[PDB]
PDB file of C-alpha atoms and ligand atoms in Angstrom:
ATOM      1  CA  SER U   1      -6.711   0.524  26.317  1.00 41.33           C
ATOM      2  CA  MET U   2      -7.575   2.979  23.236  1.00 41.50           C
ATOM      3  CA  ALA U   3      -6.197   6.075  21.341  1.00 41.20           C
ATOM      4  CA  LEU U   4      -8.624   9.345  22.339  1.00 39.20           C
ATOM      5  CA  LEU U   5      -8.079  12.743  21.955  1.00 39.59           C
ATOM      6  CA  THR U   6      -7.414  14.893  24.501  1.00 38.49           C
ATOM      7  CA  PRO U   7      -8.777  18.492  25.134  1.00 34.99           C
ATOM      8  CA  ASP U   8      -4.188  19.830  25.014  1.00 35.82           C
ATOM      9  CA  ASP U   9      -4.418  17.801  21.544  1.00 34.82           C
ATOM     10  CA  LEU U  10      -7.153  20.249  20.506  1.00 34.47           C
ATOM     11  CA  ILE U  11      -5.904  23.179  21.316  1.00 35.07           C
ATOM     12  CA  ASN U  12      -5.896  26.365  18.965  1.00 35.74           C
ATOM     13  CA  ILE U  13      -7.534  24.464  16.300  1.00 38.55           C
ATOM     14  CA  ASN U  14      -7.767  27.136  13.382  1.00 40.80           C
ATOM     15  CA  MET U  15      -4.265  27.689  13.750  1.00 42.67           C
ATOM     16  CA  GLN U  16      -3.637  24.070  13.463  1.00 42.22           C
ATOM     17  CA  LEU U  17      -5.882  23.436  10.859  1.00 40.72           C
ATOM     18  CA  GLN U  18      -4.216  26.699   8.696  1.00 41.07           C
ATOM     19  CA  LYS U  19      -1.165  25.077   9.490  1.00 39.33           C
ATOM     20  CA  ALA U  20      -1.868  21.753   8.581  1.00 38.26           C
ATOM     21  CA  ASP U  21      -3.262  23.725   5.385  1.00 39.15           C
ATOM     22  CA  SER U  22      -0.370  25.546   4.246  1.00 39.61           C
ATOM     23  CA  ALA U  23       1.813  22.088   4.741  1.00 37.66           C
ATOM     24  CA  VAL U  24      -0.559  20.468   2.644  1.00 39.34           C
ATOM     25  CA  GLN U  25      -0.893  22.842  -0.724  1.00 39.42           C
ATOM     26  CA  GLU U  26       2.850  22.845  -0.246  1.00 39.56           C
ATOM     27  CA  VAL U  27       3.191  19.471  -0.438  1.00 40.40           C
ATOM     28  CA  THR U  28       0.736  18.961  -3.359  1.00 38.22           C
ATOM     29  CA  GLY U  29      -0.417  21.975  -4.876  1.00 37.13           C
ATOM     30  CA  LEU U  30      -3.612  21.894  -3.553  1.00 38.34           C
ATOM     31  CA  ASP U  31      -5.316  22.808  -0.532  1.00 39.67           C
ATOM     32  CA  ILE U  32      -7.541  20.690   1.716  1.00 41.00           C
ATOM     33  CA  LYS U  33     -10.911  21.568   0.017  1.00 43.12           C
ATOM     34  CA  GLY U  34      -9.155  20.854  -3.305  1.00 40.15           C
ATOM     35  CA  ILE U  35      -7.988  17.097  -2.212  1.00 41.75           C
ATOM     36  CA  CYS U  36     -11.344  16.452  -1.263  1.00 44.95           C
ATOM     37  CA  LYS U  37     -12.602  17.426  -4.481  1.00 45.94           C
ATOM     38  CA  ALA U  38     -10.022  14.853  -6.001  1.00 46.12           C
ATOM     39  CA  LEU U  39     -11.102  12.330  -3.393  1.00 45.01           C
ATOM     40  CA  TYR U  40     -14.732  12.771  -4.052  1.00 47.18           C
ATOM     41  CA  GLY U  41     -15.531  15.242  -6.584  1.00 48.91           C
ATOM     42  CA  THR U  42     -17.258  17.658  -4.392  1.00 48.62           C
ATOM     43  CA  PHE U  43     -17.725  20.720  -2.887  1.00 48.11           C
ATOM     44  CA  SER U  44     -19.138  22.425  -0.038  1.00 45.94           C
ATOM     45  CA  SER U  45     -22.567  24.687  -0.287  1.00 47.54           C
ATOM     46  CA  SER U  46     -23.002  25.519   3.246  1.00 48.01           C
ATOM     47  CA  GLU U  47     -25.340  21.936   4.338  1.00 47.18           C
ATOM     48  CA  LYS U  48     -26.404  22.163   7.338  1.00 47.88           C
ATOM     49  CA  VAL U  49     -24.355  20.437   9.564  1.00 47.44           C
ATOM     50  CA  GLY U  50     -25.679  19.492  13.482  1.00 47.09           C
ATOM     51  CA  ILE U  51     -22.852  18.487  15.483  1.00 45.86           C
ATOM     52  CA  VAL U  52     -24.221  16.057  18.718  1.00 45.99           C
ATOM     53  CA  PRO U  53     -21.758  15.741  21.726  1.00 45.57           C
ATOM     54  CA  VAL U  54     -21.734  12.052  23.376  1.00 46.28           C
ATOM     55  CA  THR U  55     -21.664  11.261  26.471  1.00 47.73           C
ATOM     56  CA  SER U  56     -20.976   7.721  25.887  1.00 46.75           C
ATOM     57  CA  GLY U  57     -17.818   5.529  27.509  1.00 49.26           C
ATOM     58  CA  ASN U  58     -15.498   7.849  27.964  1.00 49.22           C
ATOM     59  CA  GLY U  59     -17.655  10.541  27.707  1.00 49.87           C
ATOM     60  CA  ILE U  60     -17.407  14.371  26.810  1.00 49.81           C
ATOM     61  CA  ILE U  61     -14.017  15.297  25.288  1.00 50.34           C
ATOM     62  CA  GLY U  62     -13.141  18.961  26.741  1.00 50.05           C
ATOM     63  CA  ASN U  63     -12.937  20.948  23.034  1.00 48.09           C
ATOM     64  CA  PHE U  64     -14.267  18.211  20.765  1.00 46.82           C
ATOM     65  CA  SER U  65     -17.451  19.278  19.973  1.00 51.35           C
ATOM     66  CA  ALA U  66     -15.880  23.602  19.878  1.00 51.46           C
ATOM     67  CA  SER U  67     -13.225  21.563  17.426  1.00 53.96           C
ATOM     68  CA  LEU U  68     -15.501  20.154  14.788  1.00 53.93           C
ATOM     69  CA  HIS U  69     -17.795  23.607  14.843  1.00 54.29           C
ATOM     70  CA  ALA U  70     -14.755  25.489  13.982  1.00 54.80           C
ATOM     71  CA  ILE U  71     -13.740  22.612  11.524  1.00 57.32           C
ATOM     72  CA  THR U  72     -16.763  22.636   9.830  1.00 60.95           C
ATOM     73  CA  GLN U  73     -17.072  26.127   9.473  1.00 57.06           C
ATOM     74  CA  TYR U  74     -13.592  26.481   8.092  1.00 55.79           C
ATOM     75  CA  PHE U  75     -14.899  24.516   5.808  1.00 56.41           C
ATOM     76  CA  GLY U  76     -17.732  26.311   4.555  1.00 57.51           C
ATOM     77  CA  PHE U  77     -20.390  24.408   6.325  1.00 58.15           C
ATOM     78  CA  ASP U  78     -22.998  25.869   8.665  1.00 60.32           C
ATOM     79  CA  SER U  79     -22.593  24.317  11.473  1.00 60.78           C
ATOM     80  CA  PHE U  80     -23.966  23.723  14.909  1.00 60.08           C
ATOM     81  CA  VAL U  81     -23.922  22.117  18.033  1.00 61.89           C
ATOM     82  CA  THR U  82     -26.730  20.892  19.907  1.00 63.86           C
ATOM     83  CA  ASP U  83     -27.357  21.555  23.773  1.00 63.29           C
ATOM     84  CA  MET U  84     -28.434  18.091  24.566  1.00 58.64           C
ATOM     85  CA  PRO U  85     -26.128  15.198  24.170  1.00 56.44           C
ATOM     86  CA  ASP U  86     -27.069  11.748  23.307  1.00 59.33           C
ATOM     87  CA  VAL U  87     -30.535  10.384  21.661  1.00 58.67           C
ATOM     88  CA  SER U  88     -32.083  14.410  22.632  1.00 62.54           C
ATOM     89  CA  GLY U  89     -28.966  16.133  20.951  1.00 63.05           C
ATOM     90  CA  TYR U  90     -29.401  14.049  18.295  1.00 62.83           C
ATOM     91  CA  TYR U  91     -33.459  15.031  17.712  1.00 66.83           C
ATOM     92  CA  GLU U  92     -32.519  18.801  18.807  1.00 63.58           C
ATOM     93  CA  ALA U  93     -30.533  18.169  15.772  1.00 65.58           C
ATOM     94  CA  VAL U  94     -32.646  16.620  13.478  1.00 63.55           C
ATOM     95  CA  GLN U  95     -35.790  19.560  14.356  1.00 62.59           C
ATOM     96  CA  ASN U  96     -33.445  21.797  14.388  1.00 60.08           C
ATOM     97  CA  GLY U  97     -33.022  21.092  10.316  1.00 64.01           C
ATOM     98  CA  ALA U  98     -29.548  19.365  10.232  1.00 62.95           C
ATOM     99  CA  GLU U  99     -28.708  17.625   6.841  1.00 63.23           C
ATOM    100  CA  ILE U 100     -25.651  16.274   8.158  1.00 62.64           C
ATOM    101  CA  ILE U 101     -25.016  14.554  11.665  1.00 62.50           C
ATOM    102  CA  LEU U 102     -21.915  14.283  12.891  1.00 63.63           C
ATOM    103  CA  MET U 103     -21.262  12.242  16.256  1.00 64.62           C
ATOM    104  CA  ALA U 104     -18.552  10.263  17.668  1.00 63.85           C
ATOM    105  CA  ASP U 105     -18.669   7.643  20.946  1.00 64.20           C
ATOM    106  CA  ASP U 106     -15.173   6.192  21.804  1.00 66.80           C
ATOM    107  CA  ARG U 107     -15.358   3.500  19.026  1.00 67.85           C
ATOM    108  CA  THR U 108     -17.101   5.432  15.815  1.00 64.00           C
ATOM    109  CA  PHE U 109     -17.063   8.819  14.664  1.00 62.92           C
ATOM    110  CA  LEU U 110     -19.328   9.072  12.069  1.00 62.08           C
ATOM    111  CA  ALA U 111     -20.973  11.773   9.431  1.00 62.63           C
ATOM    112  CA  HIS U 112     -24.588  10.871   8.312  1.00 63.84           C
ATOM    113  CA  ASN U 113     -25.987  12.963   5.048  1.00 64.29           C
ATOM    114  CA  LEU U 114     -29.806  12.499   6.005  1.00 63.96           C
ATOM    115  CA  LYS U 115     -30.268  13.459   2.620  1.00 63.27           C
ATOM    116  CA  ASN U 116     -28.973  11.325   0.165  1.00 67.65           C
ATOM    117  CA  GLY U 117     -28.039   8.568   2.879  1.00 72.13           C
ATOM    118  CA  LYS U 118     -24.558   8.549   2.691  1.00 71.01           C
ATOM    119  CA  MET U 119     -22.672   7.597   6.097  1.00 72.45           C
ATOM    120  CA  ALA U 120     -18.957   7.889   6.442  1.00 71.92           C
ATOM    121  CA  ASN U 121     -16.628   6.698   9.288  1.00 70.13           C
ATOM    122  CA  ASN U 122     -13.572   8.465  10.156  1.00 69.35           C
ATOM    123  CA  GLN U 123     -11.109   5.763  10.462  1.00 68.98           C
ATOM    124  CA  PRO U 124     -11.093   4.922   6.674  1.00 69.32           C
ATOM    125  CA  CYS U 125     -11.703   8.644   5.776  1.00 66.40           C
ATOM    126  CA  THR U 126      -8.640   9.768   7.741  1.00 66.72           C
ATOM    127  CA  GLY U 127      -6.423   6.635   6.710  1.00 66.12           C
ATOM    128  CA  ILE U 128      -7.709   8.066   2.881  1.00 65.80           C
ATOM    129  CA  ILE U 129      -7.153  11.529   2.823  1.00 63.87           C
ATOM    130  CA  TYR U 130      -3.493  11.458   4.714  1.00 63.26           C
ATOM    131  CA  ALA U 131      -2.384   8.904   2.172  1.00 64.49           C
ATOM    132  CA  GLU U 132      -3.779  10.812  -0.679  1.00 65.91           C
ATOM    133  CA  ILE U 133      -2.003  13.823   0.523  1.00 64.49           C
ATOM    134  CA  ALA U 134       1.656  11.940   0.813  1.00 67.02           C
ATOM    135  CA  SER U 135       1.362   9.924  -2.500  1.00 67.42           C
ATOM    136  CA  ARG U 136       0.560  13.535  -3.828  1.00 72.49           C
ATOM    137  CA  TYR U 137       3.916  14.985  -2.714  1.00 68.52           C
ATOM    138  CA  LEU U 138       5.096  16.927  -6.292  1.00 72.09           C
ATOM    139  CA  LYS U 139       8.965  15.870  -5.748  1.00 77.20           C
ATOM    140  CA  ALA U 140       9.008  12.752  -4.830  1.00 75.29           C
ATOM    141  CA  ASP U 141      10.186  10.761  -7.975  1.00 76.27           C
ATOM    142  CA  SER U 142       9.619   7.883  -6.888  1.00 76.20           C
ATOM    143  CA  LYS U 143       5.669   5.449  -6.529  1.00 76.38           C
ATOM    144  CA  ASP U 144       7.404   3.643  -3.536  1.00 75.00           C
ATOM    145  CA  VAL U 145       5.290   4.557  -0.478  1.00 71.32           C
ATOM    146  CA  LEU U 146       6.081   3.172   3.036  1.00 74.24           C
ATOM    147  CA  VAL U 147       2.821   2.369   5.704  1.00 78.83           C
ATOM    148  CA  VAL U 148       3.484   2.164   9.195  1.00 78.40           C
ATOM    149  CA  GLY U 149       0.505   0.813  11.309  1.00 75.23           C
ATOM    150  CA  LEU U 150      -2.206  -1.084   9.489  1.00 73.94           C
ATOM    151  CA  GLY U 151      -4.927  -0.457  11.844  1.00 75.73           C
ATOM    152  CA  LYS U 152      -7.962   0.735  11.415  1.00 77.28           C
ATOM    153  CA  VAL U 153      -6.766   3.845  10.067  1.00 76.17           C
ATOM    154  CA  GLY U 154      -3.538   2.651   8.356  1.00 78.19           C
ATOM    155  CA  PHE U 155      -5.111  -0.360   6.574  1.00 81.07           C
ATOM    156  CA  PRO U 156      -7.717   1.869   4.620  1.00 85.19           C
ATOM    157  CA  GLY U 157      -4.620   4.239   3.415  1.00 84.24           C
ATOM    158  CA  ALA U 158      -2.210   0.910   2.159  1.00 79.99           C
ATOM    159  CA  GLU U 159      -5.658   0.315   0.369  1.00 80.41           C
ATOM    160  CA  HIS U 160      -5.961   2.919  -0.913  1.00 80.57           C
ATOM    161  CA  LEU U 161      -2.146   3.753  -2.203  1.00 85.94           C
ATOM    162  CA  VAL U 162      -2.480   0.228  -3.702  1.00 85.34           C
ATOM    163  CA  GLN U 163      -5.748   1.470  -5.549  1.00 88.72           C
ATOM    164  CA  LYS U 164      -3.641   4.509  -6.648  1.00 88.35           C
ATOM    165  CA  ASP U 165      -0.991   1.863  -8.283  1.00 89.88           C
ATOM    166  CA  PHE U 166       1.829   2.850  -6.019  1.00 86.32           C
ATOM    167  CA  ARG U 167       4.384   0.310  -4.745  1.00 84.30           C
ATOM    168  CA  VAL U 168       3.587  -0.175  -1.083  1.00 87.44           C
ATOM    169  CA  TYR U 169       5.716  -1.188   1.218  1.00 88.81           C
ATOM    170  CA  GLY U 170       4.172  -1.768   4.913  1.00 93.42           C
ATOM    171  CA  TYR U 171       5.265  -2.019   8.415  1.00 93.20           C
ATOM    172  CA  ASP U 172       3.292  -3.336  11.595  1.00 95.83           C
ATOM    173  CA  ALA U 173       4.851  -4.468  15.207  1.00 92.52           C
ATOM    174  CA  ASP U 174       1.777  -6.526  15.299  1.00 91.03           C
ATOM    175  CA  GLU U 175       2.908  -9.856  12.864  1.00 93.08           C
ATOM    176  CA  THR U 176      -0.939 -10.626  12.666  1.00 95.83           C
ATOM    177  CA  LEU U 177      -1.540  -7.242  11.178  1.00100.31           C
ATOM    178  CA  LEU U 178       0.944  -7.384   9.037  1.00101.96           C
ATOM    179  CA  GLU U 179      -0.143 -10.545   7.584  1.00103.85           C
ATOM    180  CA  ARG U 180      -3.562  -9.783   6.892  1.00106.15           C
ATOM    181  CA  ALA U 181      -2.433  -6.565   4.721  1.00107.85           C
ATOM    182  CA  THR U 182      -0.074  -8.531   2.960  1.00108.71           C
ATOM    183  CA  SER U 183      -2.249 -11.420   2.227  1.00108.73           C
ATOM    184  CA  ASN U 184      -5.486  -9.366   1.914  1.00107.53           C
ATOM    185  CA  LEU U 185      -4.097  -6.228  -0.012  1.00104.61           C
ATOM    186  CA  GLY U 186      -0.548  -7.562  -1.773  1.00106.13           C
ATOM    187  CA  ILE U 187       1.535  -4.714  -0.154  1.00106.89           C
ATOM    188  CA  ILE U 188       5.300  -5.758   0.064  1.00106.78           C
ATOM    189  CA  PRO U 189       6.346  -6.220   4.224  1.00106.02           C
ATOM    190  CA  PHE U 190       8.706  -4.040   4.870  1.00108.91           C
ATOM    191  CA  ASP U 191      11.945  -5.448   7.052  1.00109.38           C
ATOM    192  CA  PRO U 192      13.397  -2.398   9.236  1.00107.52           C
ATOM    193  CA  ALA U 193      16.598  -4.383   9.605  1.00108.90           C
ATOM    194  CA  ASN U 194      16.732  -4.061   5.747  1.00114.20           C
ATOM    195  CA  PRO U 195      15.592  -0.563   5.523  1.00115.41           C
ATOM    196  CA  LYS U 196      15.364   1.186   2.730  1.00114.73           C
ATOM    197  CA  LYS U 197      14.863   5.180   2.315  1.00110.61           C
ATOM    198  CA  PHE U 198      11.477   6.889   1.249  1.00108.61           C
ATOM    199  CA  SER U 199      10.775   9.928   0.022  1.00105.99           C
ATOM    200  CA  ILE U 200       6.813   9.112   0.341  1.00105.41           C
ATOM    201  CA  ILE U 201       6.001   7.846   4.356  1.00104.89           C
ATOM    202  CA  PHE U 202       2.231   7.316   5.826  1.00104.66           C
ATOM    203  CA  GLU U 203       2.057   6.728   9.219  1.00104.75           C
ATOM    204  CA  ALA U 204      -1.134   5.636  12.126  1.00105.37           C
ATOM    205  CA  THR U 205      -0.124   4.319  14.560  1.00104.63           C
ATOM    206  CA  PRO U 206      -0.697   6.252  18.451  1.00105.17           C
ATOM    207  CA  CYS U 207       3.461   5.961  19.497  1.00105.27           C
ATOM    208  CA  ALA U 208       5.819   8.009  19.267  1.00106.50           C
ATOM    209  CA  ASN U 209       9.472   7.916  17.451  1.00107.15           C
ATOM    210  CA  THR U 210       8.245   5.125  15.076  1.00109.94           C
ATOM    211  CA  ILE U 211       9.679   6.811  12.101  1.00110.42           C
ATOM    212  CA  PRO U 212      13.139   5.320  11.929  1.00109.89           C
ATOM    213  CA  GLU U 213      16.805   7.845  10.866  1.00108.73           C
ATOM    214  CA  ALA U 214      17.459   5.028   7.981  1.00111.56           C
ATOM    215  CA  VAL U 215      14.348   5.007   5.804  1.00114.58           C
ATOM    216  CA  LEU U 216      13.987   8.815   5.628  1.00117.66           C
ATOM    217  CA  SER U 217      15.569  10.816   2.835  1.00114.07           C
ATOM    218  CA  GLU U 218      15.925  14.921   2.710  1.00115.29           C
ATOM    219  CA  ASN U 219      12.462  16.918   2.284  1.00117.76           C
ATOM    220  CA  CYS U 220      10.500  13.625   2.268  1.00117.14           C
ATOM    221  CA  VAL U 221       6.914  13.457   2.843  1.00118.51           C
ATOM    222  CA  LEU U 222       5.742  12.426   6.303  1.00116.67           C
ATOM    223  CA  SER U 223       1.860  12.259   6.492  1.00118.88           C
ATOM    224  CA  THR U 224       0.251  11.307   9.730  1.00123.86           C
ATOM    225  CA  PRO U 225      -2.393  11.326  11.577  1.00124.23           C
ATOM    226  CA  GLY U 226      -1.272   9.454  14.269  1.00122.45           C
ATOM    227  CA  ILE U 227      -0.752  10.936  18.087  1.00122.85           C
ATOM    228  CA  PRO U 228       1.579  12.252  19.221  1.00126.33           C
ATOM    229  CA  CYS U 229       4.309  12.482  16.431  1.00129.26           C
ATOM    230  CA  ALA U 230       5.852   9.593  14.715  1.00126.89           C
ATOM    231  CA  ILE U 231       9.568  11.633  14.245  1.00123.58           C
ATOM    232  CA  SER U 232      11.487  13.606  16.578  1.00123.47           C
ATOM    233  CA  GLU U 233      11.972  16.556  15.938  1.00123.83           C
ATOM    234  CA  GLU U 234      15.681  16.557  15.560  1.00120.08           C
ATOM    235  CA  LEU U 235      15.379  14.116  12.773  1.00120.37           C
ATOM    236  CA  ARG U 236      12.089  16.109  11.321  1.00120.64           C
ATOM    237  CA  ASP U 237      14.809  18.785  11.488  1.00120.15           C
ATOM    238  CA  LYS U 238      17.623  17.333  10.285  1.00119.39           C
ATOM    239  CA  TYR U 239      16.068  15.119   7.385  1.00114.68           C
ATOM    240  CA  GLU U 240      13.859  18.689   6.343  1.00115.90           C
ATOM    241  CA  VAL U 241      10.839  16.222   6.531  1.00111.43           C
ATOM    242  CA  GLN U 242       7.970  18.111   5.611  1.00110.96           C
ATOM    243  CA  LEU U 243       4.967  16.742   7.896  1.00112.42           C
ATOM    244  CA  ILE U 244       1.350  16.841   7.170  1.00114.87           C
ATOM    245  CA  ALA U 245       0.184  16.096  10.979  1.00117.71           C
ATOM    246  CA  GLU U 246      -3.107  17.731  12.384  1.00121.53           C
ATOM    247  CA  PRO U 247      -5.372  16.490  15.108  1.00120.82           C
ATOM    248  CA  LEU U 248      -9.291  16.179  13.844  1.00122.27           C
ATOM    249  CA  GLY U 249      -9.579  18.535  11.002  1.00122.78           C
ATOM    250  CA  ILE U 250      -8.069  16.682   7.899  1.00125.54           C
ATOM    251  CA  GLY U 251      -9.865  13.814   8.745  1.00128.47           C
ATOM    252  CA  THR U 252     -13.331  15.253   9.691  1.00124.90           C
ATOM    253  CA  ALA U 253     -12.932  17.426   5.675  1.00124.85           C
ATOM    254  CA  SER U 254     -12.398  13.899   4.089  1.00124.51           C
ATOM    255  CA  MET U 255     -15.647  12.720   6.050  1.00127.75           C
ATOM    256  CA  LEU U 256     -18.150  15.529   5.404  1.00127.02           C
ATOM    257  CA  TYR U 257     -16.986  15.736   1.553  1.00124.50           C
ATOM    258  CA  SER U 258     -17.568  12.190   1.399  1.00124.13           C
ATOM    259  CA  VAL U 259     -21.002  12.362   2.137  1.00123.66           C
ATOM    260  CA  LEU U 260     -22.070  15.307  -0.146  1.00127.06           C
TER     261      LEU U 260
HETATM  262  N1  LIG G 301      -5.545  12.803  13.524  1.00126.56           N
HETATM  263  C1  LIG G 301      -6.864  12.782  13.164  1.00126.56           C
HETATM  264  O1  LIG G 301      -8.179  12.935  12.862  1.00126.56           O
HETATM  265  C2  LIG G 301      -6.891  10.706  13.841  1.00126.56           C
HETATM  266  C3  LIG G 301      -5.690  10.153  14.294  1.00126.56           C
HETATM  267  N2  LIG G 301      -6.056   8.739  14.719  1.00126.56           N
HETATM  268  C4  LIG G 301      -5.137   8.292  15.384  1.00126.56           C
HETATM  269  O2  LIG G 301      -4.338   7.723  14.710  1.00126.56           O
HETATM  270  C5  LIG G 301      -3.780   6.245  15.303  1.00126.56           C
HETATM  271  C6  LIG G 301      -4.095   4.790  15.051  1.00126.56           C
HETATM  272  O3  LIG G 301      -5.869   4.745  14.872  1.00126.56           O
HETATM  273  P1  LIG G 301      -6.299   3.301  14.834  1.00126.56           P
HETATM  274  O4  LIG G 301      -5.886   3.141  13.255  1.00126.56           O
HETATM  275  O5  LIG G 301      -7.672   3.690  15.038  1.00126.56           O
HETATM  276  O6  LIG G 301      -5.668   2.372  15.722  1.00126.56           O
HETATM  277  P2  LIG G 301      -5.181   0.898  15.575  1.00126.56           P
HETATM  278  O7  LIG G 301      -4.926   0.674  17.042  1.00126.56           O
HETATM  279  O8  LIG G 301      -6.419   0.316  14.847  1.00126.56           O
HETATM  280  O9  LIG G 301      -3.897   0.896  14.862  1.00126.56           O
HETATM  281  C7  LIG G 301      -2.782   1.143  15.545  1.00126.56           C
HETATM  282  C8  LIG G 301      -1.700   0.292  14.953  1.00126.56           C
HETATM  283  O10 LIG G 301      -0.315   0.974  14.989  1.00126.56           O
HETATM  284  C9  LIG G 301       0.254  -0.316  15.555  1.00126.56           C
HETATM  285  N3  LIG G 301       1.912   0.257  15.701  1.00126.56           N
HETATM  286  C10 LIG G 301       1.800   0.315  17.360  1.00126.56           C
HETATM  287  N4  LIG G 301       2.788   0.344  17.909  1.00126.56           N
HETATM  288  C11 LIG G 301       4.115   0.464  16.188  1.00126.56           C
HETATM  289  C12 LIG G 301       5.297   0.998  15.697  1.00126.56           C
HETATM  290  N5  LIG G 301       6.150   1.488  16.979  1.00126.56           N
HETATM  291  N6  LIG G 301       5.457   0.276  14.833  1.00126.56           N
HETATM  292  C13 LIG G 301       4.730   0.112  14.380  1.00126.56           C
HETATM  293  N7  LIG G 301       3.133  -0.220  14.270  1.00126.56           N
HETATM  294  C14 LIG G 301       2.862  -0.116  15.608  1.00126.56           C
HETATM  295  C15 LIG G 301      -0.425  -1.126  15.984  1.00126.56           C
HETATM  296  O11 LIG G 301      -0.131  -2.493  15.902  1.00126.56           O
HETATM  297  C16 LIG G 301      -1.606  -1.599  15.369  1.00126.56           C
HETATM  298  O12 LIG G 301      -1.971  -2.485  14.615  1.00126.56           O
HETATM  299  C17 LIG G 301      -4.200   6.720  16.692  1.00126.56           C
HETATM  300  O13 LIG G 301      -2.856   7.002  17.265  1.00126.56           O
HETATM  301  C18 LIG G 301      -5.272   7.805  16.589  1.00126.56           C
HETATM  302  O14 LIG G 301      -5.772   7.797  17.647  1.00126.56           O
HETATM  303  C19 LIG G 301      -7.449   8.465  14.810  1.00126.56           C
HETATM  304  C20 LIG G 301      -8.656   8.904  14.281  1.00126.56           C
HETATM  305  C21 LIG G 301      -8.581  10.338  13.490  1.00126.56           C
HETATM  306  N1  LIG G 302     -18.489  11.357  22.504  1.00121.52           N
HETATM  307  C1  LIG G 302     -16.983  13.022  22.552  1.00121.52           C
HETATM  308  C2  LIG G 302     -15.850  12.631  21.717  1.00121.52           C
HETATM  309  C3  LIG G 302     -15.240  10.710  21.767  1.00121.52           C
HETATM  310  C4  LIG G 302     -14.283  10.741  20.064  1.00121.52           C
HETATM  311  C5  LIG G 302     -13.401   9.411  20.451  1.00121.52           C
HETATM  312  N2  LIG G 302     -12.531   9.318  19.603  1.00121.52           N
HETATM  313  C6  LIG G 302     -11.464  10.558  18.962  1.00121.52           C
HETATM  314  O1  LIG G 302     -10.789  10.919  19.905  1.00121.52           O
HETATM  315  C7  LIG G 302     -10.663   9.770  17.493  1.00121.52           C
HETATM  316  C8  LIG G 302     -11.523  11.192  16.945  1.00121.52           C
HETATM  317  C9  LIG G 302     -10.501  11.557  15.834  1.00121.52           C
HETATM  318  C10 LIG G 302      -9.571  11.695  15.599  1.00121.52           C
HETATM  319  C11 LIG G 302      -9.170  10.785  16.706  1.00121.52           C
HETATM  320  N3  LIG G 302      -9.244   9.852  17.689  1.00121.52           N
HETATM  321  C12 LIG G 302     -17.484  13.752  22.395  1.00121.52           C
HETATM  322  O2  LIG G 302     -18.666  13.834  22.215  1.00121.52           O
HETATM  323  O3  LIG G 302     -16.560  14.816  22.733  1.00121.52           O
HETATM  324 MG1  LIG G 303      -7.028  15.183  11.089  1.00120.19          MG
HETATM  325 NA1  LIG G 304       2.720   8.361  15.885  1.00122.40          NA
END
């Protein structure tokens, strides 16, 4: 089984990004650019970005390149999408003066800066930024964070939180992933039968309704790249949960600012 974006996930990406940016600003005091500035020290200066469609594996995803095109323009990069896909697309991008290559198959989504040699992988970049946003919740009043999902996105997020000196509690429905996180990162295994309430939650799972009512507190932040939503509308509304959740753009920003 594979977790991949679908074209419907990406509809009106510009509005999705705007809403996410507003939520990030409300929660943390910074916009997405400022968050990236905090993580990486970098800012955009109209670097040329070539976006190469890839027919590998399950193939080109409807809306995917177009969404990257919009996302990169939104953050102030000089981006373009190649006509040709795959290697012929890569050549086209380089020939047309791209400084950064953005491309993805079903297992890897990367950004490679050809000018300074830095390369980013989407999975850790997404995990780090969504964890960073969570952790900057201005009205948190606590350094306890719950991390749900300790896979390719969730593990690097948890690791980041541990480095930033939060008290990280982690849960993954796969006992082996949980054990790997506790023994490699030193996080506290969360026991769902013995819950406690959090004001900061980071979720990175491909599953609905992973966040149980018992861990919620009023006005808590739930920062989640996971798709579909980790929390029902009912529980979101009931606790006035401040949700940060967007399908591509926040993690893409994290990749781009990390290679500047
Ligand atoms: N918004 C965005 O920009 C992006 C979103 N994603 C999405 O993030 C999610 C996670 O991606 P990866 O870490 O690569 O997947 P992964 O498969 O590496 O890890 C997911 C983890 O969640 C765990 N899990 C599943 N159900 C659970 C439950 N009920 N409770 C606790 N843990 C549970 C799994 O055991 C697994 O360890 C996916 O839905 C993926 O589509 C990924 C990249 C970027
Ligand atoms: N080769 C396709 C793209 C495949 C991308 C697959 N990866 C995902 O869907 C990741 C991208 C990061 C956000 C969540 N999931 C294309 O070029 O259109
Ligand atoms: Mg995102
Ligand atoms: Na989810």
